[PDB]
């Protein structure tokens, strides 16, 4: 019988919910997540430069030259160094490497 | 809600309108359908885009922190490092989370405010040429053509063209 | 009253979900709330105002309310969630609170261990207590189904049998006990009491036969 | 963790974050331009409005 | 949790009138609306009664609409309830407890609170049938092994069967009450044990039939 | 104010109404008194409760810091510890104080917005069956019964039932 | 905008009015000109002044930090100092910048809200004695004297004094 | 940047019909509205064509309103274009590129994005005249000094004149194409050099007349 017009807003099948000081777990139309928790559980390059690994030794036996860590040798370059926790080839002849923590810090750079 | 538009006197949204955020829906013997509002939706999208862009820009400053090796006699420096890094983590986490909450709040408020503003614009353009309902819908007293429909959509509705017409058709 | 699903299931770290439906009188009008009843314990407040965690600060629990429906969700769902769960609303049409009565759940418990059966008849105090009652027990097994058979000298009784505890909140250890009460005029005159427990996890029957010695 | 032939721009202690997001919850220790580490689980920003379909 | 205690629990006879109550403490109580809820033994709950901070809104249940009468003394900080026309259809546990209710039941000053009293006080069992209070009988069972105690001939299930008066719970199991043909329920409780502590540490199961206020215990020893 | 409801066109609050936050007051020969609005007050209380709960939740992260003993030759580490702890204290204090201020601001704004929304709902339900004053009070043109009063409180007011009645009673 | 007053249904501002922030402009054969509103402008200025004062007060807490000399064997303590100072700098910069953005947002919103509130006050005082346009301007049905103009400025406009006059003059 | 590639470029003859296309990759493409823009050789741009994520809105230009026809395959992730009535007035480069457009051209799900696809894919040259594909001729010039190579008799300017196949750019200069009276354009490219690497490191200029797919190179050596 009569003419009509309405003023509405967009709705869809969106089920992604957001939170708010007043109401929480409220379904919104478009939500953008800012946090990233999914990762590739491996070690990649940085600036296309190959990292360094020991896999049986420590940094101590590496720069001291333990005969069982001679795979790392000569002129080398890297971006970051990986040290395995259960390594067994470290300081062979017992002693104390002075300022070892500062040495590791200076080697990391 | 706060402005009463979203989930208020306009209870449900329109699952059909996929041409924009805020828009109208008209149904007469000449035709039926939804039609979004270009300017209001584009302005809201621009505001939201600038908000998100600024939020990500001001947060790009990375706090670098690595755990150096600490000796047996460096318990104090280790505890200092731990406390500093944990405090920075707590500060950043709190800031980000509460910013997210407050921004979602004021964003939804801005959305329903835009809806109410569009409704009140349509109201002010149809002072007495149309009756109002409790669902954000207007019932023209004189039947409008689709050209009048667009003239209301664009906001160029002409009042003296239909003043006497609606004044005559309104009583019967 | 209210509606409530029967049960729920999910592996540890699978985000178990539970629903709660009502009408415009209770859920569509006012807020809902949740409750958790640990086995045999006075229960606690789970969620109020459809999303809020109380000062008990349980983080893994999530609440949602959408019109006529409400939803509870648990991420991780460690073994400390083996308990009854309950949903409630206000029923604005009436006045007092309304409850969806009863929803339990179970976690994915890998049943590799068969139940350990123990069969020991009572002592002379039971003989002097005017009635004899022999028991056979099973424990530390995942599924609720377990079959017990009584045999008094290779002959069962016309109907007398077991009970079962809820899920052990530590390591999903269900347990059950079968009771067999007979009179002393029918207890000592028999020469072999036996109970045979059969279960899906067991390959063969578990027979425990105590002799009147 | 092992070393694999992989090209990335952001290397963390427990993996790789190859993403454009601004935050993360993996770890604070990294090399490169990695997102910021936070204790949050989700940082969803509501860009639209309340979804109330009919 | 906060301070709570009950009064009136036990085993009451049918056909008579009941008068239960509960009193809490720990902080102010004269400004909150309290709840009374039911729990059928086993599975099932059903809300029962509401009371305001002052007592204006009564608003009883549907099943007992106008059948009971609650009351509270905010100067004594107690919440009591008197009801007649009792039958076995109400045999169940009942809890006095603060649940999230609409704002008007709470006081004008406590409409907003960080922790809105997640309190839910403990339970009070009432069981009405043609029976009385009897004496519980505990029989232990002797042979890594496992030993237990059975409790027969005690009417309700109010006992938290304890071992050495609350000593061991890492590997114990408490089973529900068992009825067969008698008037009183039987029950079992078990606990594992290695093969090195059979005679050294004496193990005694301690029970309590509270309607009889029993503390009959039993040491478990082999042949 | 911002929405003009609280301390605006409704100058004073009602010391008598203790049944809720926002409510009505009606006085006719049939009866007089105040009566709160259940839904709006409960929604505002829910919003405030969630706000406070989230504020306390996101702030529970404690920054632990103890002052270890520093020697005569540890002036630098001591100054570093002092600067770190003082900076964290300043950051936390500033964050908490400014959050408190802004939250009180927007909370009072939300309260007066709820008041104005209730008033505008009552206005939209009584388009021409009632006159409006400058104090948020409506004067029914036709006298309403207490049942009509509740039908306005619940929002189920029926317009065509009183249209002609108010149209006749409005001129005299 | 959000409230539609500034850059909305009132498109352009008045370069002439330098007597206040929000004000009226009236032009009849008796006289013409702009005239600011004392109370609303003073209230907005008070709010902005308190906002700025609190912002500067809560930010006066200075984080002191100097770079002590670190030796060849103090690389770790130097890196810790650098990370702590850089994190504090990032936190303070982010906080200040985002506070500035959000405060400018809500300040402009408050300004246009004040404009809309003044317009709606003038609307509520002139229920049917004046017609409304789409530019925030009111056209009195009966011609008002300058004394009526002030009575609208101060808000003491008397309705029954001009009710019948406007009712008669409105049709022709 | 993201993955992009073109198809149909080169030197086409006038009076015929053209059919160009471009395909991108790197992430989803079936949900964005793409653009086609023009660039007159030297100075001047002019937008040409739009296309939605689905193809509803066509909305051609003014200069070619209804003259061309664009299309896209979102299952193949490609954007093609077919046009007739070609003349030398359209001799220019053209880019398929995402530019900031109104929201309705983009999908319903991507109305908001942090980085709104600042992509602007590479160019595709089309030159229509009375000519064909010829063979380029490279002449080097020999004498801190500077040496160069001239490329004459090659029709378009598609070559990135390279030295030792992309070796030196710190001090090189690539000059625009030069016409005088012939049908094909001439061009120069230069690079400086110290007085200590004239005969040690051999320097070769490498060109590519792509419409002929030439790789004719030339070593530069003095008397
Ligand atoms: C809110 O509750 C819903 C339950 O439907 C859950 O899926 C979601 O993860 C919760 N959190 C958020 C932020 O939506």
């Amino acid at each position: 019988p009569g003419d009509k017009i309405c003023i509405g807003y967009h709705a869809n099948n969106s089920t992604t919910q957001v939170d708010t000081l007043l109401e929480k777990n409220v379904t919104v139309t478009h939500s953008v997540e800012l946090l990233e928790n999914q990762k590739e559980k491996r070690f990649c390059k940085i600036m296309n430069k190959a990292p360094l690994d020991l896999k049986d030794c420590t940094i101590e036996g590496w720069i001291l030259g333990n005969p069982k860590c001679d795979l790392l040798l000569g002129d080398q370059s890297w971006s970051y160094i990986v040290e395995r926790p259960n390594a067994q080839n470290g300081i062979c002849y017992p002693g104390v490497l002075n300022e070892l923590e500062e040495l590791k810090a200076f080697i990391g750079s | 809600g706060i402005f009463g538009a979203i989930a208020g006197f306009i209870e449900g949204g329109w699952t059909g309108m996929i041409d924009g955020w805020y828009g109208y829906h008209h149904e007469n013997s000449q035709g039926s359908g939804y039609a979004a509002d270009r300017e209001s939706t584009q302005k809201a999208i621009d505001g939201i885009t600038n908000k998100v862009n600024s939020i990500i820009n001001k947060m790009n400053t990375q706090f670098e922190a690595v755990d150096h090796e600490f000796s047996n006699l460096e318990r104090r420096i280790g505890n200092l490092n731990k406390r500093m890094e944990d405090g920075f983590l707590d500060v950043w986490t709190y800031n980000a989370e509460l910013l997210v909450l407050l921004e979602n709040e004021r964003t939804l408020d801005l959305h329903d405010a835009n809806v109410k503003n569009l409704y009140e614009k349509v109201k002010s353009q149809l002072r007495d040429n149309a009756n109002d309902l409790g669902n954000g819908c207007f019932e023209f007293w004189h039947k409008c053509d689709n050209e009048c429909m667009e003239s209301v959509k664009n906001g160029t509705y002409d009042y003296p063209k239909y003043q006497k017409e609606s004044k005559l058709n309104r009583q019967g | 009253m209210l509606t409530q699903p029967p049960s729920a299931s999910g592996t540890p770290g699978q985000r178990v979900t539970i629903s709660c439906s009502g009408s415009s009188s209770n859920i569509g009008g006012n807020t809902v709330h949740w409750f958790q009843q640990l086995p045999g314990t006075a229960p606690k407040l789970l969620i109020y105002t459809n999303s809020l965690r109380p000062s008990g600060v349980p983080d893994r629990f999530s609440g949602s309310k959408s019109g006529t429906s409400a939803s509870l969700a648990i991420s991780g769902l460690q073994s400390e969630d083996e308990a009854d769960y309950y949903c409630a609303a206000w029923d604005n049409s009436l006045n007092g609170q309304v409850f969806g009565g009863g929803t339990k759940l179970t976690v994915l418990g890998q049943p590799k261990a068969a139940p350990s059966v123990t069969l020991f008849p009572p002592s002379s105090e039971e003989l002097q207590a005017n009635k004899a009652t022999l028991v056979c027990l099973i424990s530390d097994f995942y599924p609720g189904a377990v079959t017990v058979a009584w045999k008094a000298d290779s002959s069962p009784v016309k109907a007398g049998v077991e009970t079962t505890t809820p899920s052990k909140q530590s390591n999903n250890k269900y347990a059950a006990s079968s009771y067999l009460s007979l009179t002393p005029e029918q207890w000592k005159s028999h020469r072999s009491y036996s109970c045979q427990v059969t279960h899906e996890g067991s390959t063969v029957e578990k027979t425990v036969a105590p002799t009147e010695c | 963790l092992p070393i694999e032939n992989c090209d990335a721009t952001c290397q963390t202690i427990t993996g790789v974050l190859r993403t454009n997001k601004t935050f993360q919850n993996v770890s604070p220790l990294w090399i490169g331009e990695c997102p910021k580490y936070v204790k949050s689980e989700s940082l969803r920003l509501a860009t639209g409005l309340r979804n109330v379909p009919q | 949790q906060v301070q709570l205690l009950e009064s009136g629990g036990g085993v009451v006879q049918p056909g008579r009138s009941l008068r239960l109550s509960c009193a809490a403490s720990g902080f102010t109580f004269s400004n909150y609306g309290m709840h009374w809820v039911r729990q059928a033994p086993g599975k099932g709950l059903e809300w029962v009664a509401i009371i305001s901070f002052d007592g204006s809104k009564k608003y009883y249940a549907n099943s007992v609409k106008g059948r009971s009468t609650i009351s509270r003394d905010n100067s004594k900080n107690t919440l009591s309830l008197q009801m007649e026309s009792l039958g076995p259809e109400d045999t169940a546990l009942y809890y006095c407890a603060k649940l999230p209710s609409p704002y008007y039941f709470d006081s004008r000053f406590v409409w907003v609170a960080a922790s809105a009293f997640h309190f839910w006080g403990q339970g009070i069992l009432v069981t009405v049938s043609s029976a009385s209070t009897k004496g519980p009988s505990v029989f232990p069972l002797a042979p890594t092994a496992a030993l237990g105690c059975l409790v027969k001939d005690y009417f309700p299930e109010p006992v938290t069967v304890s071992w050495n008066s609350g000593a061991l719970t890492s590997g114990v199991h408490t089973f529900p009450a068992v009825l067969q043909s008698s008037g009183l329920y039987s029950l079992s409780s078990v606990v594992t044990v290695p093969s090195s502590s059979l005679g050294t540490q004496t193990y005694i199961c301690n029970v309590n039939h509270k309607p009889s206020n029993t503390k009959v215990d039993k040491r478990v020893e082999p042949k």
Side-chain angles (χ1 to χ4, degrees), chain A, chain B, chain C residues 1-109 111-118 120-125 127 129 132-133 135-137 139 141-145 147-154 156-157 159-167 170 174-178 180-184 189-190 192-193 195 197-199 201-204 207-211, chain D, chain E:
Chain A
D3 275 12
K4 238 169 176 173
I5 193 184
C6 300
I7 292 88
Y9 41 80
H10 173 100
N12 47 357
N13 45 335
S14 186
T15 51
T16 42
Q17 319 177 30
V18 302
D19 290 326
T20 279
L21 299 178
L22 310 179
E23 313 137 18
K24 288 182 64 176
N25 314 75
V26 172
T27 65
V28 86
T29 37
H30 312 74
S31 79
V32 176
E33 180 59 37
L34 300 170
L35 179 136
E36 168 72 73
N37 52 359
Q38 295 293 350
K39 38 148 182 303
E40 325 186 330
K41 245 179 180 170
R42 64 168 166 265
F43 289 162
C44 304
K45 289 203 286 282
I46 292 300
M47 283 194 298
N48 296 258
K49 187 160 294 183
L52 222 35
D53 196 354
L54 322 162
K55 256 169 159 184
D56 206 18
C57 298
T58 68
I59 284 192
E60 305 81 294
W62 165 38
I63 38 67
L64 287 174
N66 192 306
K68 324 180 132 198
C69 319
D70 260 325
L71 271 93
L72 311 149
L73 219 49
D75 314 47
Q76 300 265 341
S77 50
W78 69 91
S79 52
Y80 60 96
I81 302 180
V82 180
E83 184 182 35
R84 309 303 180 183
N86 291 84
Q88 294 285 327
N89 296 327
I91 294 184
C92 51
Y93 204 102
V96 174
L97 179 51
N98 278 74
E99 298 300 333
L100 155 68
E101 304 69 12
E102 212 77 30
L103 173 63
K104 293 187 173 179
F106 170 79
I107 285 180
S109 169
Chain B
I2 167 177
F3 282 80
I6 289 182
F9 64 84
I10 307 167
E11 175 174 332
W14 294 336
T15 78
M17 168 170 39
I18 59 192
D19 310 54
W21 278 352
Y22 331 109
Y24 334 108
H25 166 77
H26 66 79
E27 172 166 339
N28 54 13
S29 297
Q30 295 176 331
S32 64
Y34 321 88
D37 180 283
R38 44 172 207 91
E39 194 207 277
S40 61
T41 292
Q42 187 64 29
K43 256 202 181 67
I45 289 186
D46 290 352
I48 294 310
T49 300
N50 184 28
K51 170 183 301 187
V52 175
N53 175 271
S54 295
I55 277 188
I56 303 182
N57 272 21
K58 311 311 177 178
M59 271 292 200
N60 191 31
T61 60
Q62 40 87 21
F63 160 62
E64 217 156 337
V66 299
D67 179 82
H68 277 326
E69 277 238 346
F70 284 127
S71 66
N72 43 327
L73 302 173
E74 271 144 79
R75 200 162 232 289
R76 280 171 311 147
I77 320 176
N79 176 267
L80 203 153
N81 190 310
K82 171 192 170 303
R83 292 184 293 109
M84 177 259 290
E85 288 182 2
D86 280 358
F88 274 125
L89 174 61
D90 295 359
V91 166
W92 278 121
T93 280
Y94 159 88
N95 277 14
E97 293 196 358
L98 222 62
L99 175 77
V100 157
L101 301 212
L102 182 49
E103 274 318 315
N104 298 329
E105 182 188 306
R106 83 184 308 102
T107 296
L108 302 185
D109 294 10
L110 163 68
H111 280 272
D112 56 64
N114 291 336
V115 177
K116 173 200 163 191
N117 279 15
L118 187 61
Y119 148 78
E120 278 199 345
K121 155 180 284 298
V122 181
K123 174 189 184 63
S124 65
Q125 293 205 276
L126 311 181
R127 47 197 70 178
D128 51 10
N129 284 6
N131 193 33
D132 186 22
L133 310 182
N135 43 31
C137 297
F138 289 87
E139 211 187 44
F140 308 87
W141 272 138
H142 74 279
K143 304 322 141 303
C144 262
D145 206 349
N146 293 358
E147 180 213 297
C148 156
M149 221 71 46
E150 166 64 271
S151 77
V152 180
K153 298 180 179 175
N154 208 350
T156 80
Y157 167 96
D158 188 291
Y159 181 69
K161 205 159 213 177
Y162 308 103
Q163 167 171 34
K164 43 170 176 53
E165 202 177 310
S166 57
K167 190 179 183 64
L168 290 190
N169 303 14
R170 74 195 316 155
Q171 190 51 238
Chain C
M1 310 328 177
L2 258 196
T3 75
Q4 180 137 110
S7 310
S9 54
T11 79
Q14 218 184 22
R15 195 181 165 279
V16 51
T17 83
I18 297 95
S19 57
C20 184
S21 298
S23 66
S24 67
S25 55
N26 37 25
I27 289 190
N30 316 66
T31 72
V32 315
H33 30 283
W34 297 84
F35 304 105
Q36 168 188 344
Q37 176 151 21
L38 296 141
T41 78
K44 308 286 178 166
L45 193 292
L46 254 186
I47 287 180
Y48 65 98
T49 325
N50 310 331
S51 187
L52 280 308
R53 64 201 101 260
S55 54
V57 61
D59 181 284
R60 292 180 282 95
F61 305 153
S62 155
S64 179
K65 180 258 220 308
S66 65
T68 324
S69 57
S71 79
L72 185 275
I74 296 183
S75 67
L77 60 144
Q78 46 206 49
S79 302
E80 286 78 15
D81 302 322
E82 294 179 323
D84 290 42
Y85 283 106
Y86 300 109
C87 160
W90 174 241
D91 196 328
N92 201 179
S93 71
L94 181 270
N95 297 312
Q97 222 88 351
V98 77
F99 266 97
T103 180
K104 307 143 178 211
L105 48 61
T106 316
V107 293
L108 196 275
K112 192 197 68 175
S116 301
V117 187
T118 293
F120 311 118
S123 61
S124 301
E125 190 170 352
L127 280 314
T133 296
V135 197
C136 297
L137 65 98
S139 172
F141 64 110
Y142 149 74
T147 187
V148 186
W150 283 107
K151 267 193 208 144
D153 276 7
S154 299
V157 299
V161 239
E162 68 298 22
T163 80
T164 297
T165 184
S167 306
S170 301
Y174 266 108
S177 67
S178 203
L180 175 66
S181 267
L182 295 178
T183 62
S189 293
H190 286 34
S192 180
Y193 321 97
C195 51
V197 170
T198 63
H199 195 195
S202 56
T203 301
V204 297
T207 307
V208 296
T211 301
Chain D
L1 296 201
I3 294 181
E4 303 183 5
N5 186 18
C6 155
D7 225 318
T9 167
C10 155
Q11 177 70 69
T12 71
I13 177 85
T14 59
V16 185
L17 303 185
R18 267 198 283 198
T19 186
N20 75 289
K21 316 249 199 196
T22 165
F23 286 76
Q24 55 99 346
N25 44 326
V26 173
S27 53
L29 299 87
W30 80 69
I31 179 174
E33 44 185 17
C34 297
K36 209 179 311 167
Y37 170 74
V38 282
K39 264 193 169 187
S40 52
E41 292 182 345
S42 68
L43 294 171
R44 63 280 159 201
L45 265 179
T47 54
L49 52 63
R50 201 196 221 96
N51 199 26
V52 187
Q54 295 300 110
Chain E
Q1 209 198 3
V2 278
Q3 322 177 19
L4 40 74
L5 55 90
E6 332 296 308
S7 52
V11 173
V12 72
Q13 307 183 28
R16 289 169 167 82
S17 51
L18 58 78
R19 184 234 194 98
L20 306 189
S21 182
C22 94
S25 49
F27 224 140
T28 46
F29 168 74
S30 312
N31 47 333
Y32 290 83
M34 274 305 177
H35 298 48
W36 272 105
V37 294
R38 102 158 68 176
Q39 181 268 342
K43 174 184 183 179
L45 289 135
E46 209 168 13
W47 169 93
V48 193
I50 215 74
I51 186 55
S52 303
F53 57 91
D54 67 328
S56 294
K57 311 301 206 182
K58 284 299 204 183
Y59 286 177
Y60 300 86
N62 162 80
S63 175
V64 294
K65 204 154 186 186
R67 193 152 78 94
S68 318
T69 297
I70 40 60
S71 173
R72 71 189 288 173
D73 200 314
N74 285 9
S75 189
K76 311 304 183 308
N77 308 314
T78 326
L79 171 63
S80 181
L81 156 65
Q82 182 179 63
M83 179 174 54
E84 242 286 0
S85 68
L86 319 177
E89 69 283 350
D90 308 332
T91 298
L93 270 149
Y94 296 88
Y95 317 86
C96 70
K98 162 66 180 182
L99 284 69
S101 63
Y103 72 99
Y104 39 63
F105 283 173
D106 307 23
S107 156
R108 168 184 35 173
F109 333 120
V110 297
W111 276 337
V112 279
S115 181
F117 263 72
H118 60 58
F119 145 72
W120 204 346
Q122 311 274 100
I124 305 158
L125 179 61
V126 282
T127 47
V128 279
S129 184
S130 61
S132 54
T133 81
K134 291 280 201 304
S137 50
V138 175
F139 304 140
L141 299 178
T144 57
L147 283 75
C149 283
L150 171 142
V151 184
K152 197 181 181 181
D153 224 24
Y154 83 119
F155 174 79
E157 210 297 293
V159 54
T160 75
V161 278
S162 54
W163 295 82
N164 297 77
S165 302
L168 209 163
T169 54
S170 178
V172 309
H173 298 277
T174 295
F175 301 102
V178 201
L179 210 34
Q180 33 204 350
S181 324
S182 56
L184 310 194
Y185 309 152
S186 84
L187 182 142
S188 310
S189 52
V190 301
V191 50
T192 57
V193 50
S195 61
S196 55
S197 298
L198 262 302
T200 298
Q201 214 68 35
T202 307
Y203 278 132
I204 306 102
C205 59
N206 307 85
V207 311
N208 171 237
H209 176 13
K210 193 173 301 180
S212 67
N213 291 276
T214 319
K215 277 301 179 61
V216 160
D217 308 351
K218 200 61 190 302
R219 162 192 175 180
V220 202
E221 54 181 346
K223 56 196 171 186

